[PDB]
Every structure is written in C-alpha cells, then in structure tokens.
Amino acid sequence: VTAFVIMTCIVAAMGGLLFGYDLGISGGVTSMEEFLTKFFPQVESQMKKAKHDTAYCKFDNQMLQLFTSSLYLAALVASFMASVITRKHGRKVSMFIGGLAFLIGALFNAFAVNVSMLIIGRLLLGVGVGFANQSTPVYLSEMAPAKIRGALNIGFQMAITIGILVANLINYGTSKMAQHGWRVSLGLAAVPAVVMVIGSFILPDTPNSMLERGKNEEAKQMLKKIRGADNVDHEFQDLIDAVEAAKKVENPWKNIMESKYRPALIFCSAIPFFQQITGINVIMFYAPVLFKTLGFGDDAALMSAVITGVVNMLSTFVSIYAVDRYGRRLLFLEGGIQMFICQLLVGSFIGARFGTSGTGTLTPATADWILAFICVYVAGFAWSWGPLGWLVPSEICPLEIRPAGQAINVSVNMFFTFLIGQFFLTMLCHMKFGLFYFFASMVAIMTVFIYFLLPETKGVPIEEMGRVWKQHWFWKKYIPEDAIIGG
Template sequence: MAPANLRGALNIGFQMAITIGILAANLINYGTSKIKSGWGWRISLGLAAAPAILFTVGSLFLPDTPNSILERGNHEKAKRMLQRIRGTSNVDEEFQDLVDASTAAKQVEHPWKNFTGRKHRPQLIICTFIPFFQQLTGINVIMFYAPVLFKTLGFGDDASLMSAVITGVVNVVATMVSVYSVDKLGRKALFLEGGVQMVICQVVVAAMIGRAFGTEGEAGDMSEGVSSMMLFFICAYVAAFAWSWGPLGWLVPSEVCPLEIRSAGQATNVSVNMFFTFVIGQFFLSMLCHMKFGLFLFFGGFVIIMTIFIYYLVPETKNVPIEDMNQVWKEHGFWSKYVSNDNVTTSPP
C-alpha cells in the first residue's frame, strides 16, 4: 500500500513496533522483579495478553490492499481504495500498473512451483538467505538472553536487567535512524555499514570476555570500567543491527517479489526467520557454555559472510515501484542471466 518513495520507512514501522515491544517487555521485567511476593513473573507473562488483544481488535479495522481487491475481481473498489490511500484521484497510471501485474499473476497456476523456477531464482535466494543470515547475526544472544548474558559476564541481578533495558532503548533509537535514512541512503548502504560495525563490536566483545574469563571460562571479574566498555560495544552492536539487518531483513524480501510469487516469497521469508529464531533460542545457552567468548566470533564470522553476500548479490531497491522490480534483476550484474527479457514486467508508456 505504500508509495515507492516511502515504502522503506513505512515498512520499517513493523520493526519499530517490535523494538518498542522489546523495550516495554524489559521495563516490565525490571519492574516485576522488585515484587517481593514472588508473583512478578506471573504478572510479566500475563501482561503479554494486552498487545495480543490490541492486535486482534486492530486487525478488524485494517483495509484490504488494492492488489488484494483486484485479485478478487473488483476493479472499481480497488481503484477507490488506491485513491483513498494515495489521497488523490489521479491514480490512473499506478492503477494500470497494478492491473497489469494482477493479470500476469493470474496466469500463474502454481506459484510455489513457479517460485522455485529459474526465472525467480534471485527472489528465492534473497527470501531464503536474508532471514537465515538475520538470525545468525547473533542479535538473539543479546535480545533474548540479555539479563542472563550480563549476569554471566559479572553484572548483578539488577544491573543485568537494567543493562537489558539500556540495550532496548538503543534498539528503539537506532531503528528510528533506519526509518529516517532508508529511503535516502538506500538499503545496501545500511546493510554494509551495519555489517562492518557489528563485526568490529563482536571481535572487541570476544576479546574482552576472553581476557577477563580466559579460554576455559574460569571464574574472573571485570572492573567497573571494563564492564562499562563492554556495555558500550554491545550497545554499538545492537544499534548497528537495529538500523541494518533488523528492519532490512524484513523489508528487502518483502519488496523484491512480483505479485505472482509474492505470497510464496513472504511465506518463505517468515518461515525461515521463525525456524532459525527457534534454533538459536534452543541452542544458545549450550553454545555459550561450550564456546565461551568464541560464540561472538562464531556469529561475527557469519556477519562477514552475509556482508559479502549483500555486496555482491543484493540489488538496490530504493524508490523502485514493486510492479517494476523485475527490471532491477535484469540490470544486476550477476542475476541478469537468470531473468530473460520476456520475464521482465515494465510499466506501460
């Protein structure tokens, strides 16, 4: 529904909501930890029902997209909806683009089979590897287990919870940076800068943990200055993720697929993301126990690989209308050989 020049910022509203939710959860956990009766954890879990209720009620008021209405054959209603969301009656050219894309999509009988074909190989790779790499940045080490991690590193109970709150605030602020800059600087610039910054921070954090606790993870301690420095680099890492791989891991796969395979592409993107979220959540604590500070180097290695992946294989999609996205693949140095001229949908003159 978003216009091309604002699509990035509006799409990142999704990630912004996630970061605000994480911060709210950290604040609630910090507050309920002060309850002496031992009921704090029950309150923390129970309050999760509040956003679920808001989400359910809010979904009743969501309008259908013009594309969705077109897919069901109601052209006039689709045009009125496009005029409503654009705030103008002059939408004839854009609406014709949508009609052409919808017509082409209806000619595809098997979207899943079509998605795995040669001509959509670029979209398949992007929608699989970007969510895979997003989870292997190591961000869940910080955001899921921040209190456990900080306590393990020598912070006290209250200090570890407060440190989690601090990283949550950094997460929200840095996501705002992405909202402001993604449609100005472009997707690749944020991806590449974020990747370099994350690698540097992970290497420094690994070195500091290794110096304090040794290669065997034996008991050690950190001075207040070292602990503060550790928190700074972790926050710098969270900030880099929050303006790069966090929001762009959802944005880019959502905008590279043409209408005929969009549902298959989005399903793949979300499925891969959720699966590896589960995997990291299940195995992180065991990995931390066995790998010690090497865990940060493990994730840092993946960040290097994914940054190279972005540099060579992901095209810039800033300000490109979704209906014309196949033109991007045609002009890409590597992927152009997979996209023949007859597979490229362009706007009518």
C-alpha cells in the same frame, strides 16, 4: 503520500508488537522463581540459592528444548498456512488471525494452572507470530507509496523493538509484585493483540490484493484514497499488469521454483538465515548473563537488557531516516561492518582482560565496556539486518509469489531463530566469548553476499521490481523482458 496511508501503516505496523513483546518478556519470566516453582520444578531446584546462575540457561534438556521450540515450530507452520490465506482472502485476514491466536494464547498463559495450558498458550502465540509476521510486511510494502516504502515497512521492525523494550520494563515491574507477577507479564501480551485484531477490522486491505481477488472497482477507489489523487492511472496499470500475470498462477508453491523467480527465492531464503546468524539473539543476552555471573544480581541483569533495548529501539530511526533516501545497500554495508568490528572488539577485549587482570574476575568497569561494545553492535543490527530482514523479502517478489516468499522468510527465520539460540545456549551460559569470533565470520560472509548480489531496491514501485533484478550483473539472466512491469 497522505495522512490516511501513514495512519494506516502505523496501525498495521503495530502487529510487530506481538513478536517483540514475546521476545522481550520471556527471559524475565523464566527467571521468576514463582513461575519456575509452578511449571518447571526441576529448573527451580537448580536455581535455588544459585546467585550466579541464570534460569533460562537450565532449559537445555530434551523436554525443555521441546517446550522452547514449540513457539517457533507453530510459527513456522502457521506461516505457510498464512501464505494461502493472505493470497486467497487478503492480507488483513491473516493479520486478524495472527492477532486472534496471539490474544487467545496470552490468556491461556496468564491464567495457566498447569503446564498443559502453558503449552497450548505458547503454541497459540507461535501461530499468532507466524500469521502476523507473514502478512504485515506484505501489507506495508504494498500499501506504502513507493518513495517511502522502506520507512513505512520498517514501522513493523520499530514495533518489534518497542515490544522488546516495553516487555523488559514490564518484567521490571512485575518482578516486584508479592505474587502472580508472571501472570501479569504473560497476560499483558493480550493488549497489543487486541489492538491488532481491532485494527484488522478497521484497516483497508491493499489495492494489490483487492484487484488480484477480483475487486476491480474497490481496488481502484482504494488506490485513489491512499494516494490522495483522482488520477492513479499509471500506478493502477502496474496493479492491472501484475494481476494479469498473477492470475495465471493458481499454486505459487508449485511455480516458485521457476527460473524467473530465482533471485526472489534465494533472498527470501538467505536473508532470514543471515539475520539470525548475525548472533543477535545470542549476543543480546551476553551482558545479562555476564552481570549475573559477576554477582550483580537479577536487577542489574534486567537493567542491561533495558539499556540494550533502548539502544535497539532508538537506533531503528536511523534506518527509517536513511532507507529510502540513501538505500538498503548502504544500511546493510555499514551495519555489517559495524557489527563485525564490534564483535572483534568484544571478543578480543574479553580475551585480553583475563590475560592482564590477575584476579580472574572481570571488574564492573570492564563489564560496562563489554555492554557498551555490545550496544554498538546492537545499534548496527538495529538499522541493518533487523529492519531489512523484514523489508527486503516483502519488496522483491512478484505478486503471485509475494505471500509465499514472505512465508519462506518467516518460516526460515523461525527455524534458525530457535536453532541458533538453542545451539549457542551453553556457550552463552558458560561465557564462551569465542562465539563473538564465529558470529563475526558469519557477518563478514553475509556482508560480502549483500555487496555482490543485492541490487538497490529503494524507490521502485513494488510491482516494477523486476526492472531492478533485470539490471543486476548476475541476476539479469533469470529475468525475462516480458515479465517486467513498467519501465
């Protein structure tokens, strides 16, 4: 562990600011009537004097769903392109492309004069997220010393939560400008993108990719630099062994179906689906919608998003502290149990407060308790399925399929992020609290899935992770001894 590798990983992790900024900025921008008037006049007409309505609830027709979907579709496709570039040219090159596409997208948005420019900008944001999310977790998990890989990789998730929070605060400010507030909100996304582009110039690439691409002496000297030791022979032998196997595989997409990759393939596919079917991106807007329906105004709705965003960010530190000391499993298990219980409590609390009230409207105190329970659910996600959904796929793949497995992770993640968010929009917007019971049942399923099927990965050198699958009661049948590195 050196100061150079920690600074390297902090700078690289700032690639998560891009996706997080976009996740946090969009809600507040859609509620700005100047934005609606310019680009979505059919929505503006529905929102005029609709004191108890929320503008993104109106994005439920085919054309508006197409606009919303375009970011996730571009990200899903760009993720697959990033797998090829990340392997052939390096993790840094994909991080550069991600920052640059996001930067150009932010400018098209901020200076949009018609919806055509908004569509181009949104597609470019999606390209940026696809490249940034595909490549940055690979970068962190290869660069980090094995002992603290969890903590350093989760810097990426921390950056996501920082972007969400910062973006909500920016919308708080730009909502007060006399004019053009939405241009400032969408244009400030360029700031972390410029940081990411310049970072991609100055960062080194990973020794793992340098060696796979034939830069033998550069890779060894780089490993010595990030580990701060003249003798890296044991860990460099891991890289040599990983590249010897990896050089045999010209097309990872045509080999990822082989038995020896099956545990990795299952988890790279299942973890992103499970991460979204927690309901996180639905539940995170339940209280904002509730406060608006109760008459508390746009500012109270945004304030609950800021509160939720602070909890979301600060709770990430629990995973940073515990992930390498106590393990990924403990975090999955506690986080799933805590999320499950909070979903049961909020669902039954809302259901009960209508059968005991008498007046038909929830009180402010009741709304605050609903936000409180939701915040404990968000805290549980924020130290489990949030950070681990960007850590675990990046640390379980052999080198030759590591960019491809992380591309599966991103692309499945984008697909279900949109699908689940759109599918539940009407239930969210009509305050159908039964959704908490559905997501509770999914969280039960994924927690049992983890309990029986996820071997503990903490502290294992990334190229030696086959050792962990080989000792798992179920996955051991897929892993041949000859493929295992180290031991």
